[PDB]
Every structure is written in structure tokens, then in C-alpha cells.
Design a protein around this ligand. Structure first.
Ligand SMILES: O=P(O)(O)O[C@@H]1[C@@H](O)[C@@H](O)CO[C@H]1O
Length: 479
């Protein structure tokens, strides 16, 4: 009746602390260990899996009091996995200056400095009532609490261990509890029958790293795995020819890209970055590797942004004449430039890289692939080009143009992008006005600067495919 699930995955997070696990591979595991205050209804307003109405979870009800403050009334008798009852103190700690957004917290949780809202300290009104506050107005509080930033941690236990040690022995309120974590290999979680919500339907879940997608496909076919992730459209015909197996695929609110270590002199200025960007023939990559199912967005611009999505925005540019002109202008001396990829952690990362190496050879740039195994990522000083992705995790263009590429983000801080002052001033402005034609035009100006500066280059939104046994009716891969 409750089976032990075996999931063959593309990767394993570096930790199970819920914010530090934010990645393509962490949420599928941490969403089973932890809960949020509220959850998105992915099928509200007729949406086919990307709906946005908010529904109760750890909070049974909530009331926006003013433009800076939201009161949450918590469920009672919710138990953390170690038997401690969750209270307003735990929720307050989760969004506190100490743990999340203060100066010392940002050292151990870097996304607390860039992915946090402009929080002020939560207020605990009573055992089951907490008020989440912001120092400046924002309408995003409630939806933020359904996001990957909103997973609730146990104050006493987390504070005692600290962020890093908690990530190796996580305790949450979710339907599965931690058993084991072997870095670069596996995570095992087991049913928590003390869960406040629906009883878990699997006895145990094992997430096993299977680096190569053909090995994942073969393991599904042999019964070694019940579910496998991160496949491509090319795998679908073979899998679906087995009557006991099936695939599912769709465009995800995430883009694959490549980016630069702009602390390196070779990438300290925009010309060679933009040269590499203008030489990418995205329709050809999409045709050869994605069966024309991946979609190319019109800039850093996605429909989930709603009022800040521009459906009429122009396409991103492909111009090898300008690319060649920019290589010569940069003074590039033929010095090999590495491009680091952790295998096919991103679907089709290595075949797309090989096609782009040919494109860059045509404009006079020598790019060398540096394919590393999980756990072998280079030190920042040895990193030049690398691949990446960004999940568009809010119904607002603030994510990820601002939270990743803005003045508080990692692209400018860790990776050294010296953005124009106009860019950082507009990032500040859009975070102070409601949705209007003015806010709409400011995001389009940020998009234009992004394309001119090329701190990163958007490739496409992947057509994400997973596969499973038909008789496995619940799949904890957060698709
Ligand atoms: O590409 P990953 O690093 O696995 O995940 C990224 C995160 O780093 C952050 O950018 C949010 O989007 C994910 O896709």
C-alpha cells in the first residue's frame, strides 16, 4: 500500500537548509521536509499548473493589516519531526534579522541579502499569531510566503546547531522526515505519520544521483528507479513505448543561461561578453537538441510577471558581424577561456556547450570545456565562463532581474559585474511603485541594459521532462 520510492535525479543539493538548498535539485527534497505558511493553488483561475491564488498551510488564516504588515494565525499542535510544537516563535525566527536578513545572517545565507524582502523584525502576538513586517511597503509578502524562501524552521534546534550544521541534520514539519544525506550521492527521507496534513502515501523516498540521463532512462526501464528527472524530448518515444511507463513534459518558468566571472580581467568589461552573446544561434540549438520544444523568450521577460511581462518585446539579438567587431575591439589575444559545467546537471548542458564552442570558434574565440563531477566545482579565481539557470519564482519582474542581477545580488557582489548606475537606480525605483505604465517601462529599460552589458546570456526555457511508472501515482519531484 505505501511503497518505498526510488528517484533517479540529475543532482543533489549541497545542503538541506531550505534557503541554501535553492537550486534546480534542492526544492524537490526540501519541499517534503518542510512546510510554508501558505501555498499556491497551481490550478486556480483555470491555470494548467502555474496558478497563483494562495491557500492555507501552516497558517490557517491571514490578514494584511497595512502596506507593511501581515498577520498570520497558525495551526495549533503542528509538530516538528523531533516532537517540538511549532509556534509563532519559530515563524518569527525564520524571517528574523538573526537568521535571515541581518548582516551576520547574510554571511551564512547569502540569499538572505538578495532574495529577502525588505523585512523588519517579526512580532509575536501570542503563541499562534505572528505579524510579518517590512520596513517599506510591498504587496509581495503573502506570495513570498508560498515561495522557496518561506519554509519554516524550528527556532531552538536551528539556532543551537547554526545554519551549516542544521543543513546536515534538518528538522521540519513536513510529511517526510530526514534519514540520511551523502554529499554528491543521495538523500533518504521517511514518512512522518505525525504530519498535520494528509497522511504520507510513500513509506520512504530515496533521491539517488544518476549523473548520466541515459543511465536514468535505463534504470527506469529496469525497475531500479520508480521516477527519473531532467530528461529531454528525445527520450520520450522510447519511454512511452513501455506500457507501464510514461513521461510528462512542459515549459517551466526557468531559463538556462551562461555567465561570467567579471572579477577576471578578460570579463571585467562588456565587449567580449556581448561578443559571446551575439554569436549564439538559439533556434539552431533548439532544433538540434530540443525537438523545437524549448522556447526562446523575448528577453529577460516571462509571462508569469503579469503586469511586468511585455508580450510585444523584441527578440534577443544574433549578429556575428557585431560579435567579430567586438572581439577585435576587446584586444582578445587568443588565450583559452574555460567554460565550467557540472556534466548535464542542466539538461543538454554539454551538447549545447559543444555547439556554442563552434559558434565562438567562428568569431575568433577559443573556449575550452571543463566538465567537472559533483563536488569538483572550481574556486572562483579559476572560473571564467560557466552555465547557470534562474527560476522565475515570483509573479513580478523583481525576480530574478533584481534579486539576482541587482545591486544586492550575487552577479554584482560575488561575480563582480560593474553595472551602470542607471541600472541600479532603476532597480531601486521599481521597488517603490505599484504596477503602472511607469513600472512597465522601467523593467524594459533594465532589460535593454541587461542585453547591452551581457552579465549573463539567456539561452532558452527548457522543455523539462520527467518519467515514471504509471502505477506510481504521486511523484515528489516538484515539477
Ligand atoms: O541553477 P541552479 O544554481 O541549480 O538554481 C538556480 C538558483 O541558483 C537561483 O538562481 C534560482 O534559480 C535556480 O534555477
Amino acid at each position: 500500500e505505501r511503497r518505498a520510492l526510488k528517484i533517479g535525479v540529475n543532482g543533489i543539493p549541497v545542503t538541506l537548509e531550505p534557503i541554501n538548498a535553492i537550486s534546480n535539485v534542492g526544492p524537490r527534497i526540501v519541499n517534503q521536509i518542510f512546510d510554508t505558511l501558505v501555498v499556491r493553488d497551481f490550478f486556480s483561475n483555470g491555470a494548467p499548473g502555474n496558478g497563483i491564488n494562495l491557500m492555507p498551510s501552516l497558517a490557517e488564516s491571514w490578514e494584511r493589516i497595512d502596506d507593511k504588515s501581515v498577520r498570520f494565525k497558525l495551526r495549533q499542535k503542528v509538530m516538528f519531526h523531533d516532537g517540538v510544537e511549532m509556534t509563532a516563535d519559530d515563524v518569527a525566527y525564520t524571517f528574523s534579522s538573526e537568521r535571515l536578513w541581518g548582516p551576520d545572517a547574510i554571511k551564512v545565507i547569502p540569499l538572505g541579502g538578495s532574495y529577502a524582502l525588505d523585512f523588519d523584525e517579526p512580532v509575536v502576538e501570542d503563541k499562534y499569531t505572528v505579524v510579518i513586517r517590512t520596513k517599506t511597503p510591498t504587496p509581495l509578502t503573502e506570495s513570498y510566503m508560498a515561495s522557496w524562501m518561506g519554509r519554516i524552521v524550528p527556532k531552538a534546534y536551528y539556532k543551537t546547531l547554526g545554519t551549516a550544521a542544521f543543513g546536515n541534520k534538518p528538522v521540519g514539519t513536513g510529511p517526510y522526515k530526514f534519514v540520511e544525506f551523502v554529499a554528491n550521492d543521495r538523500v533518504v527521507i521517511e514518512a512522518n505519520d505525525a504530519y498535520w496534513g494528509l497522511k504520507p502515501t510513500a513509506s520512504k523516498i530515496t533521491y539517488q544521483l544518476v549523473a548520466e540521463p541515459a543511465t536514468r532512462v535505463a534504470g527506469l526501464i529496469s525497475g531500479e528507479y520508480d521516477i527519473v528527472t531532467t530528461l529531454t524530448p528525445d527520450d520520450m518515444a522510447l519511454i512511452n513505448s513501455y506500457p507501464d511507463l510514461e513521461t510528462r513534459g512542459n515549459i517551466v518558468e526557468n531559463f538556462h543561461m551562461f555567465t561570467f566571472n567579471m572579477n577576471q580581467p578578460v570579463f571585467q568589461s562588456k565587449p567580449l561578453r556581448r561578443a559571446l552573446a551575439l554569436a549564439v544561434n538559439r533556434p539552431l540549438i533548439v532544433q538540434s537538441l530540443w525537438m523545437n520544444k524549448a522556447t526562446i523568450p523575448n528577453g529577460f521577460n516571462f509571462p508569469n510577471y503579469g503586469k511586468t511581462f511585455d508580450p510585444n518585446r523584441r527578440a534577443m539579438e544574433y549578429n556575428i558581424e557585431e560579435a567579430k567587431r567586438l572581439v577585435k575591439e576587446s584586444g582578445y589575444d587568443g588565450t583559452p577561456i574555460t567554460y565550467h559545467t557540472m556534466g548535464n546537471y542542466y539538461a543538454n548542458a554539454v551538447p549545447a556547450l559543444m555547439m556554442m564552442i563552434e559558434m565562438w570558434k567562428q568569431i575568433g574565440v577559443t573556449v575550452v570545456p571543463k566538465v567537472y563531477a559533483p563536488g569538483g566545482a572550481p574556486k572562483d579565481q579559476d572560473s571564467y565562463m560557466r552555465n547557470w539557470s534562474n527560476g522565475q519564482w515570483m509573479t513580478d519582474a523583481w525576480a530574478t532581474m533584481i534579486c539576482e542581477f541587482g545591486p544586492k545580488g550575487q552577479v554584482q557582489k560575488r561575480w563582480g559585474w560593474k553595472a551602470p548606475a542607471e541600472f541600479n537606480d532603476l532597480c531601486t525605483k521599481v521597488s517603490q511603485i505599484p504596477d503602472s505604465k511607469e513600472r512597465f517601462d522601467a523593467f524594459n529599460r533594465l532589460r535593454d541594459i541587461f542585453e547591452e552589458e551581457a552579465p549573463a546570456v539567456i539561452l532558452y526555457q527548457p522543455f523539462d521532462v520527467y518519467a515514471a511508472r504509471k502505477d506510481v501515482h504521486w511523484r515528489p519531484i516538484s515539477f
